[PDB]
Amino acid sequence: RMKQIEDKIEEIESKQKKIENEIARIKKLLQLTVWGIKQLQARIL
Amino acid sequence: RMKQIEDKIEEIESKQKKIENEIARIKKLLQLTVWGIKQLQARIL
Amino acid sequence: RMKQIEDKIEEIESKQKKIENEIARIKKLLQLTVWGIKQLQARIL
Amino acid sequence: XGXXXXXXXXXXXXX
Amino acid sequence: GXXXXXXXXXXXXX
């Protein structure tokens, strides 16, 4: 049972690392879209 | 101990799935916002 | 062996909490950018 | 802000 | 710092 638990933990940790990396990617792209919106607004106004 | 651990893992796994689903949803909407910015930029330029 | 497991669950649970908090903040900023796009489009159209 | 904005965009809802 | 240019760089290269 301890082994099955350990294997599940290994799967969870791996997925957490993937999710952390995706969050970092999302934040960078989101920052770009904020910057884009600021540029568009300044032109429109 | 071992059953206590097994229950916490199950709860963790279920929260992980919810997180994965939310990340997927976020990515789809971020892609639409990128696309909408692309259309706006070209139209005003 | 079970101690190392209980300790890993502690580390995973707090990391999961960090992830949830980050996803909540990304969702708010995404909601803001969608709002800003809507305003820009309404203005030009 | 479930509204707000104004003020030329409020610097993007204050971030 | 920054950079960009190029019409938006195709959205900062994604």
Experimental structure resolution, Å? 1.4
Contact A37, D15 (CB under 8 A): no
Do D and B touch, 3+ Cβ pairs within 8 Å? The answer is no
**Using the beta-carbon criterion (under 8 Å), do C32 and D12 form an inter-chain contact?**
yes
Other C-beta atoms closer than 10 Å to the C-beta of A45 total 9
Rounded Cα gap, residues A23 and B27, in angstroms: 10
* Closest B-chain CA to C19: B19
Radius of gyration of chain B (CA): 20
The full set of domains in chain A, from first to last, is 1-45 (1.20.5.170)
Enter the tokens of residue C17: 């909490």
Rounded Cα gap, residues B22 and B18, in angstroms: 6
**Using the beta-carbon criterion (under 8 Å), do A13 and C12 form an inter-chain contact?**
yes
Which residues lie below 8 Å from residue A10, measured CB to CB, with a gap of 6+? none
For residue A33, give the nearest of C43, B5, B13, C26 by alpha carbon: C26
Count contacts between A and B (CB, < 8 Å): 44
Hey, which chains touch A, using 3+ CB pairs under 8 Å?
B, C, D, E
What approach was used to elucidate this structure? X-ray
DSSP line for A1-45: -HHHHHHHHHHHHHHHHHHHHHHHHHHHHHHHHHHHHHHHHHHH-
